[PDB]
Structures are given as C-alpha cells and as structure tokens.
Design a binder for these strands. Structure first.
Ligand SMILES: [Mg+2]
Ligand SMILES: [Mg+2]
Ligand SMILES: [Mg+2]
Ligand SMILES: [Mg+2]
Ligand SMILES: [Mg+2]
Ligand SMILES: [Mg+2]
Ligand SMILES: [Mg+2]
Ligand SMILES: [Mg+2]
Ligand SMILES: [Mg+2]
Lengths: 117, 51, 150
RNA sequence: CUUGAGUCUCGUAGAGGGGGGUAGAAUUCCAGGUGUAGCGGUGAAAUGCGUAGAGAUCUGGAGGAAUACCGGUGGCGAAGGCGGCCCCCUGGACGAAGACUGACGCUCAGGUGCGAAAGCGUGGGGAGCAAACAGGAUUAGAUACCCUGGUAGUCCACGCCGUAAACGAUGUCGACUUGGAGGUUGUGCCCUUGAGGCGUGGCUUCCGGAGCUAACGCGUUAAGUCGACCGCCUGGGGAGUACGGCCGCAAGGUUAAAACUCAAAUGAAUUGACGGGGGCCCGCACAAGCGGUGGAGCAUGUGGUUUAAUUCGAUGCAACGCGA
C-alpha cells in the first residue's frame, strides 16, 4: 500500500517491442504492462499508437498506490520511446524530469553481425 | 542526460540531449561494428564531404 | 491522373427541389430508367408516412445519421508488404456513400416488393437493424481502431 | 674539398615497438527486495526462455573482451601494423642557427629477417560474436539466405606456418617540370598588438597544365623528362596443377613442365537493350465506380477426338462470331 509519491519508471523500448515497468525511487518494482501485453501482437504492435495504450495500462495498477509525481527512464530507442511518454503526463500524472538510460559501450564487446538479410 | 525544471508546464528540451547521443551512437552499435568499412567509411564516405 | 474539374451538377427532385437528394435518386436507376425511380423512391418516401406519418423530407437526413462513416481504410505500399493507414473522408463523398450501400443492402433482402424492399430499410436503417449501420460498425471496428499505422 | 651519406648539438609532434599498472563504461552469468503473465523474436511465425516466477527492476559481487566521445578528409611506421589512461627500457622520422668527418655513396640473385587473417602445436582464459552441429521457419526443396541455441576459435604467452584484392593491383635512389584550394608538423621576421600577418623545410589530400596516355586516366606524391641497379612478362584453357629438390608436426608452401587444345582469352572505350538501379512522366494502366464473364441452357468459332474425310492457313499482347 505504501503510497510512494516519488517513485520512478522504466521504459525499455526494443524495436519489435516496448515495456513500461513502474518502480520506486529506490528501485523496487510497483506495477507494469506492455506492448504485446495488450491485445495487438506481431508487428501490429511496436507502433507508438499502441505503446501508449500500454502506458495507460500501468495507470490502472499504479493508482492502487499513491503517486503524486514521478520521473522516467528511457532504456531503449524505437517506435514507442516518445509516444509512450505522451499518454503519461496527460492521463493524470506529474513529472520531475526525464533521464536516458540506454546502452553505451566504450567499445567493449562484439555485437551481433546478425541481420544479413 | 539530465533535465528537470520548475513551474509545471510539461515543456520540452528533452531534445537538447537528442544531439549528443541518442540513436546516434546506437546505429554504430546496433547490428555490427565496421572493421574495414571504416577503412572505407570515414576515409571513403568522406568524398561525400568536400563541399 | 491530372485533371481537377470538380463535380457535375445534377437536376433536383421533381417537386421539392433537392440537389443533395438529386444524387441519391441517381444511384438507384437501372439502365437509365428514370421512369421506375421517380415512382419507387420519390414515392417510397411518402410510404414512410405510414412507418410513422411524420414530415418525410428531413425524414431522410436522419436515416442517414448512424449510416455515415467518417474515417476510412486508404491502403498504401511501404515497408515490405502493405499499409492500411485509415484516414478521414470528405463530404463530397459522405452524403453519397451511405446513400449507395443503403439501397444496396436494401436490394438483397426479400420483401414483398421494392417500393417496400426500400421503404423498409430506410426506417430499419434509421433503427440500427439491417446491414445499414452494421456495415458502418463492420468498418469503424477496423478503421480508427487501427490508428497504429494510420 | 663540400653541396651527397652522416656525427654531435639543440627543438619539436606522434595509435612506433616490448614489459608492468591501471580507472570507467558495457553485456552475461551468479545473489537476494520488488513485481506479474508475460518477455524474445520474423515479413509475419515458429524453435527457446517465464506460475520450479522470464523479462522488466534494484543492490550487490565474479569475470572476459574492447577502449564510444575525442578522431580528423588526422596522426605513425620499412610493408603486415597500430586507439583511453599511467610507469619504466627502447627505434625512427622532422627542423634550426650552427659544430663536426670528408664520396662513406644509391642499387643487390642467391643470403638473412618481419609475416593481416585463418590454421597446428604446449599450456593458459574463455564475457561477445560464431564455421562445424540441432531445432525453427521460407521453398518444389533447402545440407543456404532470416529465427533459437552452441563446439572450435576470435583473446594469452611460447613457438610453427610463412600465403591475401600483401593495394596505390603503380620497386628502389637522384634532379628536373606551369599552378591552383588544403591537412599536420617543424624554424625567420611583421605596431608579434591579432583571430592572425608574411617568407621558408618533412609529410598529405583534391583539382588539374603542358606533356605522356590504347582508352579511363597519371600530372610536383608522374603513369612528364632523363640517370644506377634488381624483379618479373611473351596467346587462351590443360596449369601455379603434375613430375624431381627444397622447406614444413601437418594443412600445405615453393622451385616449375609436357601431352592434348581452341581463334581466340584480355584492357579501356563508346552504341543500344535489360536491371528483382535511381531519378520524371504518359494511357482505363491503376485506384475510385457502373455494368458483365467463369458457373446455368443455347448459338458459334478453336485445340482435343474419331473419321473413308471430318478440306488448308491464323497458334501470347498481334488467332479463335478469325479469312466464312
Ligand atoms: Mg609515411
Ligand atoms: Mg589465428
Ligand atoms: Mg547463426
Ligand atoms: Mg587530373
Ligand atoms: Mg586481366
Ligand atoms: Mg477512354
Ligand atoms: Mg477497376
Ligand atoms: Mg458490380
Ligand atoms: Mg506455318
């Protein structure tokens, strides 16, 4: 029940998917939902006009609690890393600031040669 | 990448850090590195850059 | 593919003088037989004076109320396959759209006639039975409920 | 003897090489709070991971590889090379006044040495990519292309091999020969007041003059104009393969034929066509709409079919109610 008021959020946005996990100032989780975790799948999802109906899903599981204000992490680029933040503030939310927490090597490991389509 | 302000007015200014990284140093890392292609990308896609 | 004329003006109802309805009484007439239209629709509008008895003139525009779609599925080809980008429609087609399928579904019913196979689906259509509005919502369920690509 | 080679001096920039430190980011795997039905992924999907709690997410540890940004069209070295930072031991290259010896000189078959990657050794470590391998899907099909995993092996010394489109497919050393916008270094002088300003040496990038060039192009960094030396080349396939020597743990490397055999194999350059290459239009092309065919009878043309013959020609858009 605690009623936080100063907890955080984490928007992990891969290309073919994007999750919204609401956690607390420290780091402990709180509530969540996500793209494929809502009706549309395949690649019908990913588009921003899907990954904020998710956003407004976390709202109904993060209001059982008390959040008078929050901040956000955008670990991950892609199709739902702005639009996600849009149906945020509006659906009845404050916000100190935004902080980016996306990967950044100093050239440390090799990456997937992968897609050689 | 630090924002935050006073006077609640969901401003903007998240773009100020849009041009010191972002997908920028992600395209470089995304799939693979370059290896020899930089042997011909900074020293070859440079013919792109002479005027 | 490069001509922006406009729309071709059409002749009014033989009494009321209705251009907005002038184009309804055009998509009903088979093989240019405006001798079986000016007496099957201009008359199946006064037989709604039995489905209620009220003012049948504006007792048109409302049967086309729950029957006018406003966002549509306008395809495209970018990415690797298709694109649905549903988008809005303008009035130069709105009024007309419904008019059509409205008579269209009103054909493949099976009533006693067609002065009746039409005096029926222009009240029912106003009441949400028939394919009238079920089409409407057979569409909007896909359109504007698909603004992920739009 | 002194301008060529150089020695001292005295400056100077730099990822030059070897050894020893290291700090930060970053994945992954470990350990627990949270937290719930989800994450991962493709064109979509599947394989795999998640109610034995994925992923998200936090706080912690282990550990291996690599050093974003700076970074440059840059810098270095004799090539193959080489990128944070620190410390010791150590090359080379450049310049300025000078100071010095006095043709030492530039060429070199064989000779010796360095050797990207890959691989074989002994032994180490093994975080991430990943041949080989197994699922998964696509197809006719898939021993491949994308998906999920993963062994070697990328990494370490110690040693071998000693080949690559080993690149600029363009030896070396030396003086010439119109310039024009630069990059980086070094030293002279200009109210040095100055961003800068002007001469001048190494390196360098792009245009490009004559001229050379079979064309494309090289052009002060020459593919110009000459001078010393060494390397190789003589038509294609057969063939850098076979045969002998050599080296090599081997895999193989290199020294290198013959026999048949074809009128050609080539280089650049134009001409069009064709691109599942781009850029820009045009048509009922398409999209938007109205009608109809296939399907049902019947008329009819055709190829089948059978005929004693079913009279010849038309055979995609161009033939089929076509010449009948
Ligand atoms: Mg050099
Ligand atoms: Mg190796
Ligand atoms: Mg694979
Ligand atoms: Mg030139
Ligand atoms: Mg040749
Ligand atoms: Mg026409
Ligand atoms: Mg059409
Ligand atoms: Mg039709
Ligand atoms: Mg013939």
């Amino acid at each position: 029940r605690k009623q936080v008021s100063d907890g955080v959020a984490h928007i992990h946005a891969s290309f073919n998917n994007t999750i919204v996990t609401i956690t607390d100032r420290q780091g402990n989780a709180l509530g969540w939902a996500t793209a494929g975790g809502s009706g549309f799948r395949g690649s019908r999802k990913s588009t921003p006009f899907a990954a904020q109906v998710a956003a407004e899903r976390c709202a109904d599981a993060v209001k059982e609690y008390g959040i008078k204000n929050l901040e956000v992490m955008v670990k991950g680029p892609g199709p739902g890393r702005e639009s996600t933040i849009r149906a945020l503030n509006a659906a009845g939310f404050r916000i100190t600031n935004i902080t980016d927490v996306t990967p950044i090597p100093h050239n440390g490991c090799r990456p997937p040669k992968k897609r050689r389509v | 990448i630090k924002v935050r302000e006073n006077e609640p007015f969901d401003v903007a200014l998240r773009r100020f850090k849009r041009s010191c990284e972002k997908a920028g140093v992600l395209a470089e890392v995304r799939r693979r590195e370059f290896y020899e292609k930089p042997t011909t990308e900074r020293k070859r896609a440079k013919a792109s850059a002479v005027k | 593919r490069r001509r922006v004329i406009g729309q071709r003006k059409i002749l009014p109802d033989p009494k009321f003088g209705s251009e907005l309805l002038a184009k309804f009484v055009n998509i009903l007439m088979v093989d240019g037989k405006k001798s079986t239209a000016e007496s099957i629709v201009y008359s199946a509008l006064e037989t709604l004076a039995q489905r209620s008895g009220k003012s049948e003139l504006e007792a048109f525009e409302v049967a086309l109320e729950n029957v006018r779609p406003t966002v549509e599925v306008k395809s495209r080809r970018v990415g690797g396959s298709t694109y649905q980008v549903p988008v809005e429609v303008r009035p130069v087609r709105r009024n007309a759209l419904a008019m059509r399928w409205i008579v269209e579904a009103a054909r493949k019913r099976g009533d006693k006639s067609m002065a009746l196979r039409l005096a029926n689906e222009l009240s029912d259509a106003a009441e949400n039975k028939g394919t009238a509005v079920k089409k409407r919502e057979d569409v909007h369920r896909m359109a504007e409920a698909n603004k992920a690509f739009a």
